[PDB]
Amino acid sequence: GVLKIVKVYLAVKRRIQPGDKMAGRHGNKGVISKINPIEDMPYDENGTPVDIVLNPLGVPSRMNIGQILETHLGMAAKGIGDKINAMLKQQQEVAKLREFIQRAYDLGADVRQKVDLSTFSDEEVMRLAENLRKGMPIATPVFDGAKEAEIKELLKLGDLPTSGQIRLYDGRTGEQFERPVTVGYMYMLKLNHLVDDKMHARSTGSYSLVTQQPLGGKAQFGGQRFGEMEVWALEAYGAAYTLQEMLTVKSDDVNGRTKMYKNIVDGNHQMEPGMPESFNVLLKEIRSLGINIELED
Amino acid sequence: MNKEILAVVEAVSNEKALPREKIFEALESALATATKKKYEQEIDVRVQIDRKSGDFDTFRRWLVVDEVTQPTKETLEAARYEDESLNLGDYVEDQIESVTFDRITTQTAKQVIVQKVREAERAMVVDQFREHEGEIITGVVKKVNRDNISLDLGNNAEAVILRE
Amino acid sequence: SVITVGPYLRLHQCGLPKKMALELFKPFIYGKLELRGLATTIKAAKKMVEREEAVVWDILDEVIREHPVLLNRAPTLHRLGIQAFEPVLIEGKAIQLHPLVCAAYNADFDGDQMAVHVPLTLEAQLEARALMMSTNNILSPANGEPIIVPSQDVVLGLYYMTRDCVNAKGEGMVLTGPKEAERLYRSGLASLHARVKVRITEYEKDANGELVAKTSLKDTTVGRAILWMIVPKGLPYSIVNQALGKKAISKMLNTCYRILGLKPTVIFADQIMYTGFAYAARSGASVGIDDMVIPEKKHEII
Amino acid sequence: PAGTGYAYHQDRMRRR
Amino acid sequence: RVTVQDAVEKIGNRFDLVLVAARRARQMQVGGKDPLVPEENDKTTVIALREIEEGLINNQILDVRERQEQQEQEAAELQAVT
Amino acid sequence: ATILAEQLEAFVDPILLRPVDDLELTVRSANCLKAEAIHYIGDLVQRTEVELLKTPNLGKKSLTEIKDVLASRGLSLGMRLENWPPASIADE
């Protein structure tokens, strides 16, 4: 019993905003908290602003020291990429590009790669440098990776500082941060726990059928569950009227909440309490047995 | 047709002597021309209304001229392709519309069709005024406005009295 | 919704987005719109906030102002997991939550979510302000320990600020007050940790409710004088004269609460958090690969 | 019958 | 408004504060009584606690004023009748 | 503010001239006029619309496209030029 089905595909483009979740590849999570302007960013003595400012204090407790080696080796990779971009933007012939790319591909101990550019024939080297100019990709296998001295020797091939730390100025004050800080490139992932999929709000929506309480969820326009431990936490204060309207007026009693809505739109601010209708459902379910529950007096 | 075009026009309690085909065209425009404004095509409109079936159609104009403005409704050298059959000045229609014009305003007839019925009532009351145009006549005032008094009269016609 | 930090807040207020604020406060906005006379029937008001015209945001800032909300983190274990704030409206879609309060909720910011509840009636607004307000919960009910203890960035900013080194800019110069200590730090003539005789005026309240001024020269640092500009009157100078880790700043707030009461302890908790964040930003306290110093004796021990 | 409602339950227990 | 400490210094129970301030705010909001302290377009809750802090309102004065302004209404009714 | 301000006082018709092919309409609408050896819309404005309608090089859809172009009133307004140039269109 269906005539025709129409399916329509909307294509939203969700950008980024304060509240999305980004994370690296080591367990460094985080809700992005403020999308600063360009000027406020800590820049260095070349001019370039840093893009993301993490927090250092997550490193000694949450022991993921691999992200700092990944940061230093990423800065080494981008240093080689900047030197290729400098040697190519000046329109240099393929000999100097061949020299520098060969020096950046040898660079290590007994390794597996062992490439040579003498069999690339002067046209692939320009296209390989067209692909390396935004940075040079570096493989680091899992337990047989790049040691510290190799990262230092690759940071020495670019003209970056050896310790990986550049002194950085401030954007607001324009005066230098003491004790030079760690910059580099980290490969960060956007996770699909966005913030305009979790955010929800409800004044007065639909109500459930068997127990006259609001529906649950977001697609169903619903209200958040004021659970049992929150009832304990309001018994633990002396908040008594807050709990009474939190489980009689705002939730269940239908004549109580229509009196409440009229009283709120008239400025009154007063509740006529009544009884939860789900307690009458409890009376009907216990009473539907052989049990005779009542209400005395 | 919708197998019903010789019966709804002939209701015919209040609009028999009133124009039947025009009321049919107006109800069609309400079921259509209501919340679509058709288009921005700056041209002369012409509705064509049927009395026997009740249904109607919407034609566009071409408006024979010796000028260039209103260019979707704009001569004799172009009439030479019509073998000079057009004359200077006419509103000769040479276009139509494609089954749209408020594929909206369907059930909603308590403001649209009710609005056109109110317009027809006003038109017939002005026609009632046209049969005398002014005379010594009495009325009974019903409403009490500021510096004017509204008067009810027979056969649902009304008037007002100015304070000056 | 998802929470985020917003460290500009005072600890009785939290950030709350405009879209959630216009949805949770629909009847108050309806009542306000019907009072002014802009509209007539209720329908008109629901069309106005369905369209979100230019005049309902002033209505919204006039229904928010003194109306607390109950923030609640989803595994509420003790009573400090439901606290009442005052909203400050946020361009955004994330609840901005004051950082010190996070140590009460066990709330980090790794993807957490919190629920907001609105006290409707008038007795519930007064219970949110007088019992459940976040300024009122500064001691944990399980013991006597303060629960608005400064957690992680701010103790690093203090520990870098109130410390010393055996030579810096302005070693052993003499300063006529803490105001020119901060002026020497800002102009670029001394360092944040450089030992220095200052003249501080500590107020000891040795009488029966009367604050007696005693001024003296303390051999201290520049950072200890700058942090002395934030300490309220009654505490002695020796609460900042040490290095101020985390146990020391916790007993600083505890001695402030036992002596000067509640209101100086709330405003002093906020000033602690602000100066900790500011000088931790000025510190540039990174972490490198060279900071983890391998012992030279490690291989011979193995 | 603990918090703010303890006055209400004092009143109701007194007026029986 | 930030703290309510002196409003508990003058009413020591901290639960009677809520009853007295709710009674006072219900008199100011719907009953149409003037605030005894000049406001700054505060809501009626903060004006209630602001009157508590001045000391000019607690439960004793509220019972005194309700008995006197009930006796005034019944006295006006009796002098209108007789 | 006075010091900082004193430190800064040493610092502080086109539719007719365009081609018929440059029109927003399709290439057929331009080619209908271009079949009479017209390259600029000024040549289209130099000739009357009746004179263009007396030639079968233009089509029925080309007439609708010409009406859509003349709705902006920049071309085909029944004008007469010297040959090409107006006074604002002068040789320099």
Place this chain on the structure above:
Amino acid sequence: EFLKPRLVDIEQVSSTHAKVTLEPLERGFGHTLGNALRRILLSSMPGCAVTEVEIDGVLHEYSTKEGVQEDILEILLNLKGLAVRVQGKDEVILTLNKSGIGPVTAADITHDGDVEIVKPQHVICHLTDENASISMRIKVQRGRGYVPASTRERPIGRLLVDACYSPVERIAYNVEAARVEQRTDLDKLVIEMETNGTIDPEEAIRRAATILAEQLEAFVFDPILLRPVDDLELTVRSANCLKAEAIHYIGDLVQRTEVELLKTPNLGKKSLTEIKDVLASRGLSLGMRLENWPPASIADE
């Protein structure tokens, strides 16, 4: 007697970026003017970026066109990166037509009499067949900052790209010591900017200084209307001119416009001069509108 900065040398070392130079400066003003002009140049400078694109056979921006090896979305990104100068207009519409195998560079745009492309080697897309051609209209306008698509389209054929109206990329100042002019403790401010070609560097430093000096410009019931017309200090004729229109209070004179009074011959030529003398105090005839009589301060009690 502070030494004033004057621009001395504009070293256009490459086509994109230059190194302007300010000299002399007293000590302290180097970092002040450096950070200030850096923050103004990065914040708000007039750029000339692109807003709308209408490819011909493309309905929505997620489609694909037959004969071009990039999507329509990638064509929108490549047009978003277009570096273009305009000269005498607010907005302008550029036209692109290209047919044949190969790239569609940025020099294939039919340039108007004032639009100037500054980098004509910029690739947009690649046509990849013998009869497969794109034909688009591009809309380029002035602006300031970053105006995305979500804040600000009427047919279904327009395509809105984001608008990065910002000509500069990287502003770096380097203060350094100054030589003779026969006085030490003077500084030189050397600013290396990084433009994309749409803004002259001296024009950039001039607009930044103008914006900052504009920011420091911030600090570097009527009793006559309530009174009767006859109570005015002028003669009885000046009051009677207004009173001829049944006016007794000057609030009624303020309720009506002066043009409405000048359209009535009850007022005279000398009465107009008297009305001007009365309106010189600006208490009456200021072109106001009342409810009928009463303002809020004029309340009934």
Place this chain on the structure above:
Amino acid sequence: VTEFLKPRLVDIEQVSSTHAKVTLEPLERGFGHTLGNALRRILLSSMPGCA
């Protein structure tokens, strides 16, 4: 494109005559820091005076 929001100081909430608290609003986004930093460095570093 050049006409920004131009401020004026809305209040000078002052304590006794050698101390004050001067606000400024509204400023364009990011200009509070540049005017605060410019006025702070000029006042705190280079003023004329005698001592």
Place this chain on the structure above:
Amino acid sequence: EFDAIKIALASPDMIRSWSFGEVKKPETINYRTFKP
């Protein structure tokens, strides 16, 4: 409004006093229309 809640057994007279009619047939609804 009310004090204590009392629970006890249900007598057949008490269950007939709760009731409003004997439910005979097990037939739930019509299921092809909308009526019960």
Place this chain on the structure above:
Amino acid sequence: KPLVGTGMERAVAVDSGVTAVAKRGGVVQYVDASRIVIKVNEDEMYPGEAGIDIYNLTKYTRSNQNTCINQMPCVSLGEPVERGDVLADGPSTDLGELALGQNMRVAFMPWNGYNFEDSILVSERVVQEDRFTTIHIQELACVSRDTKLGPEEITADIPNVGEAALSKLDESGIVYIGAEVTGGDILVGKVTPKGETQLTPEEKLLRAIFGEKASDVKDSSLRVPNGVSGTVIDVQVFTRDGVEKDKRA
């Protein structure tokens, strides 16, 4: 791409099924955003079934997690390709590698409290470059059921509307392909029945004009759920056999 990878990206990219791996190597003949044509080399080629391969790429379509599973061609024209090689990159791939997120310039410093517990602070240079701007696709269905008083109507011809009620719909109810909608417009117009009653003797002329015999109707049109924008990229219409196809079907 990852600047710091493990070399394991090519196994995860090629050995999954999101990229368009070449079956027989050869010379590319025609690259397009839709299709890719490989001319097979003669030392890899069957004698019969002459053979030049056509790869029909999978353009913008819905994944299960409402992402956008795209394939982009990454080869030039006239380019040699070998057997076992990538031709079209997939989602989160680049030249046959595996690029999940993006690589950005990071600094480890406390910055004024805005990264207190675990938070992250991002420059506007990141959002200006449109570099995390992910593309999501939502599927909205609308069925034409069969109830009492008769079947339903999809024909935009319905009441209680406004120029803002169906100014984006066509003459048959279904929204256009390409119409950029807001949160709460009408995509599919759908009217169902309500009360039966009978015929009225008031709208007689109107009933002769249209010939409609319902005449009162309800409103159950599909709407964009409140909050989401978008651009309608693809409309499917399925018809149970026997039912009259309307003009858009």
